Amino acid sequence: SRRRVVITGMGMLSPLGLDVPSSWEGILAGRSGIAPIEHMDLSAYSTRFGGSVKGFNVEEYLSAKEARKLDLFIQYGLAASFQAVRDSGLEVTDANRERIGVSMGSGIGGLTNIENNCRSLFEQGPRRISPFFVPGSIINMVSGFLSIHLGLQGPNYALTTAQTTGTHSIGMAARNIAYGEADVMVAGGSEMAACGLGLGGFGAARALSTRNDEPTRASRPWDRDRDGFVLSDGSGALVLEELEHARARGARIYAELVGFGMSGDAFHMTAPPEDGAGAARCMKNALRDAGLDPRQVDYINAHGTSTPAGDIAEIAAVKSVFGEHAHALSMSSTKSMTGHLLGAAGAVEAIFSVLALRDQVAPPTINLDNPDEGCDLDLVAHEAKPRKIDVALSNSFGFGGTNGTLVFRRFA
Amino acid sequence: SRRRVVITGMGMLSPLGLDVPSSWEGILAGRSGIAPIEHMDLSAYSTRFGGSVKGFNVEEYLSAKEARKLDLFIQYGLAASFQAVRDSGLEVTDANRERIGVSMGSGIGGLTNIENNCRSLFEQGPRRISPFFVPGSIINMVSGFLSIHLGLQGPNYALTTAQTTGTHSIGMAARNIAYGEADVMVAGGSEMAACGLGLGGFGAARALSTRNDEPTRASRPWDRDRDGFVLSDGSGALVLEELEHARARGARIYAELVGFGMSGDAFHMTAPPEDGAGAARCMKNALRDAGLDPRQVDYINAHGTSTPAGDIAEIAAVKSVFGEHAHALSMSSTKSMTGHLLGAAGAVEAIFSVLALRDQVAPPTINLDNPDEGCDLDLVAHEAKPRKIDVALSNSFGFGGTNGTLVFRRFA
Ligand SMILES: CC(C)NC(=O)c1cc[nH]n1
Numbered sequence: 067s068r069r070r071v072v073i074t075g076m077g078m079l080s081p082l083g084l085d086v087p088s089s090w091e092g093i094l095a096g097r098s099g100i101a102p103i104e105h106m107d108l109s110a111y112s113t114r115f116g117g118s119v120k121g122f123n124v125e126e127y128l129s130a131k132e133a134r135k136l137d138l139f140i141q142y143g144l145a146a147s148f149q150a151v152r153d154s155g156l157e158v159t160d161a162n163r164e165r166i167g168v169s170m171g172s173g174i175g176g177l178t179n180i181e182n183n184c185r186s187l188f189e190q191g192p193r194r195i196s197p198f199f200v201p202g203s204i205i206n207m208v209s210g211f212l213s214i215h216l217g218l219q220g221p222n223y224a225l226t227t228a229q230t231t232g233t234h235s236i237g238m239a240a241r242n243i244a245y246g247e248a249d250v251m252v253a254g255g256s257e258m259a260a261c262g263l264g265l266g267g268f269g270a271a272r273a274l275s276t277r278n279d280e281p282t283r284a285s286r287p288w289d290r291d292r293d294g295f296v297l298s299d300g301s302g303a304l305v306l307e308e309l310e311h312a313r314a315r316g317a318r319i320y321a322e323l324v325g326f327g328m329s330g331d332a333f334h335m336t337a338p339p340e341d342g343a344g345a346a347r348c349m350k351n352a353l354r355d356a357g358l359d360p361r362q363v364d365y366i367n368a369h370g371t372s373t374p375a376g377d378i379a380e381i382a383a384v385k386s387v388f389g390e391h392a393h394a395l396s397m398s399s400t401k402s403m404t405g406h407l408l409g410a411a412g413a414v415e416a417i418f419s420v421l422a423l424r425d426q427v428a429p430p431t432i433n434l435d436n437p438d439e440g441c442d443l444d445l446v447a448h449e450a451k452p453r454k455i456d457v458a459l460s461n462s463f464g465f466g467g468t469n470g471t472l473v474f475r476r477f478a
Numbered sequence: 479s480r481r482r483v484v485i486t487g488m489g490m491l492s493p494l495g496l497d498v499p500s501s502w503e504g505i506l507a508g509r510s511g512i513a514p515i516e517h518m519d520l521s522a523y524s525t526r527f528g529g530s531v532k533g534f535n536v537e538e539y540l541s542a543k544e545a546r547k548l549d550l551f552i553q554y555g556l557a558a559s560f561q562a563v564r565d566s567g568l569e570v571t572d573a574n575r576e577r578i579g580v581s582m583g584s585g586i587g588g589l590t591n592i593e594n595n596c597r598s599l600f601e602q603g604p605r606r607i608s609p610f611f612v613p614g615s616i617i618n619m620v621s622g623f624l625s626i627h628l629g630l631q632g633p634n635y636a637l638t639t640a641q642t643t644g645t646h647s648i649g650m651a652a653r654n655i656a657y658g659e660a661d662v663m664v665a666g667g668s669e670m671a672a673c674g675l676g677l678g679g680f681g682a683a684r685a686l687s688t689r690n691d692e693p694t695r696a697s698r699p700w701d702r703d704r705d706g707f708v709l710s711d712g713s714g715a716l717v718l719e720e721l722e723h724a725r726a727r728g729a730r731i732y733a734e735l736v737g738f739g740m741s742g743d744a745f746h747m748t749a750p751p752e753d754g755a756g757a758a759r760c761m762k763n764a765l766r767d768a769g770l771d772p773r774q775v776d777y778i779n780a781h782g783t784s785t786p787a788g789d790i791a792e793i794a795a796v797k798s799v800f801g802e803h804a805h806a807l808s809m810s811s812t813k814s815m816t817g818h819l820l821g822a823a824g825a826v827e828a829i830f831s832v833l834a835l836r837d838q839v840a841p842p843t844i845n846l847d848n849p850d851e852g853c854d855l856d857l858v859a860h861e862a863k864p865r866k867i868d869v870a871l872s873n874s875f876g877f878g879g880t881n882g883t884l885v886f887r888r889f890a
């Protein structure tokens with residue numbers, strides 16, 4: 067019968083920092099992680115900026131020998147997983163290794179590595195493809211490599227649900243524990259899609275902000291002058307743990323994961339319905355799953371991508387789910403500062419949602435200079451807002467019309 | 479407690495045929511789907527053959543315009559999904575669409591699309607990349623497009639667990655129904671990695687058979703002369719349905735899904751442990767999940783990839799799990815005929831496992847001319863074997879040491 071699930075460990079790379087604390091200081095201070103991209107020549111691209119992980123040192127985590135075999139998205143996912151597991155204090159043993167699994171996901175996976183090997187194939191021939199091309203590129207190898215390094219023999223898998231990946235990964239890892247398939251899961255996601263194919267592909271769809279002359283002002287969720295999302299890189303990992311297992315070992319508990327919702331829009335490959343009907347169904351699933359009155363919700367970490375259609379669909383969903391209480395809760399998009407980490411978006415934002423509960427503060431939506439038509443909720447414009455937060459909700463929406471909601475609350 | 483899950487519809491593209499009954503007919507006749515790959519210059523490649531889908535007409539499923547937007551792996555997934563829903567006779571309504579979801583996965587995803595867009599990018603620059611590049615290439619677009627086409631609003635997600643994807647997708651979909659998160663799921667996997675990157679990538683790891691002179695003899699699981707797996711394309715989809723929901727509408731029930739096991743080897747990125755310790759844990763997990771004794775298992779659809787270490791690990795794992803029953807069960811690799819569909823291997827092999835139950839026949843392991851050291855089990859060499867099958871197992875073991883086992887039982 068269904069067991070309770072708590073957060074005992076968290077880990078992160080983001081455009082704001084190489085761990086959770088540094089990233090969170092940037093969030094509360096309203097700092098942008100967005101800058102012109104330096105790792106490649108983007109002069110032929112319509113977008114030349116994004117949220118890069120600055121100063122990442124893989125040799126804090128892995129031998130340069132192993133690191134060389136792995137796409138940056140895998141390196142990013144391992145760094146976050148390693149932080150989270152260390153932050154948990156949990157020791158892996160023969161007694162518990164079978165009860166500890168991993169679900170670290172990615173939207174796109176090893177596009178950089180696949181691009182570079184594609185260049186080798188075309189310019190030179192097949193004999194120049196890396197022997198590590200497959201194991202070093204495919205999405206399941208964050209889970210695989212983490213399991214190999216730490217000796218985790220529990221459920222081992224990976225989701226790929228586009229910009230929903232991080233939220234789905236965390237939610238389904240909670241269900242693993244809830245239903246007794248595991249007692250501990252490392253769950254979240256990682257993304258590094260800032261290669262020619264990534265920036266070019268989102269560019270070809272005209273989905274990206276082209277504000278190249280003011281990158282820190284580009285991500286402006288619900289602002290009338292928004293012109294698409296800002297592509298960002300990194301990773302979020304959480305240690306999910308059955309409550310009694312956590313209590314037994316005297317774990318520090320950040321918060322409890324009480325609710326998880328999924329829905330499909332069944333609307334469009336890439337566009338949300340204007341009314342946010344699928345997002346509404348998802349949040350209602352998650353709130354019923356948590357046994358909550360919707361009026362208990364204090365803070366929503368929005369998907370808030372800074373696209374015209376996405377941002378307004380989200381307001382519509384929140385107003386429909388929460389009615390008059392829509393005017394009392396605080397909703398913000400930390401994508402205003404981090405940009406959009408795609409498959410890792412739900413993972414870092416799940417961590418921001420927990421830290422909102424720990425510190426009792428709503429992170430700001432920066433750059434919200436002129437809220438758009440109907441964007442008249444508390445969106446925590448410009449500055450972090452100290453306030454009572456017992457229940458925090460984190461929304462993700464993706465291509466395919468795939469929706470995820472996580473519900474966290476304070477644990478005493 | 480837990481609801482019961484039955485299979486009411488199945489769909490497939492394989493190297494043996496463009497649907498289930500044509501594929502199954504090839505399986506029971508010991509026909510190979512393996513041949514030199516056409517319309518592709520493989521001169522510089524160490525492997526020149528594989529299992530291609532022959533004569534696929536996407537316009538039986540999609541308009542030419544909608545098909546142009548999607549990678550072959552997505553077209554194949556949609557084909558199997560539409561076949562499976564049609565085969566189930568399910569009628570989607572406003573009263574049930576929120577209870578019907580999709581989990582169709584891929585191991586490798588849109589390599590063919592990535593390859594063709596790399597060609598444009600390198601030669602001409604980013605502005606020649608297709609606008610549909612991203613949504614037409616990401617793994618969750620089979621679930622996405624299927625949900626949009628049929629109006630499915632239930633759980634919408636995609637697994638990517640390398641060669642374990644199909645097994646994990648079906649297993650976790652069965653969980654959704656068992657624990658009341660959905661009443662129906664479409665689950666399975668699709669793959670098309672017979673591009674330069676798939677043949678080249680696997681080729682660079684020397685993981686592939688190079689028997690270019692005799693492509694039909696290349697896949698020879700447990701034969702002393704095997705020299706690696708054969709890369710194959712296609713898809714499997716199953717309609718999973720709660721038992722009472724299936725009985726109420728008078729659905730035709732092929733079989734019951736009674737058990738699902740997961741484990742991680744936590745051993746190596748590409749290599750199984752010699753004793754198959756992880757595959758043994760996963761099979762034990764699956765049997766415990768089913769409430770079944772190892773003695774009650776009659777038929778195993780092996781992973782049986784035709785790799786040196788993989789084949790021998792699976793013999794050890796079966797001997798370990800099944801003790802004095804290990805010789806009484808029949809175990810075959812249908813990969814001897816189909817080759818290895820990677821992420822779709824588990825989907826098509828779940829369907830073959832279900833059909834073994836319907837038809838009371840163990841599919842052959844063809845090319846098993848000289849069993850290797852220790853390969854002394856009933857591996858159904860050369861020809862199909864009619865026999866009593868009440869309980870059938872399907873195993874998948876994948877890169878990162880991720881393992882899946884499905885347990886199916888006759889339903890009467
Ligand atoms: C990512 C796209 C497909 N969807 C949204 O932005 C969205 C916002 C509210 N509901 N859905």
Ligand SMILES: CC(C)NC(=O)c1cc[nH]n1
Pocket residue numbers: 641747748749750751754757781783785787788789791792795875876877878879
């Ligand atoms: C695909 C690799 C990682 N593993 C196997 O083939 C295998 C065989 C027995 N256990 N695992």
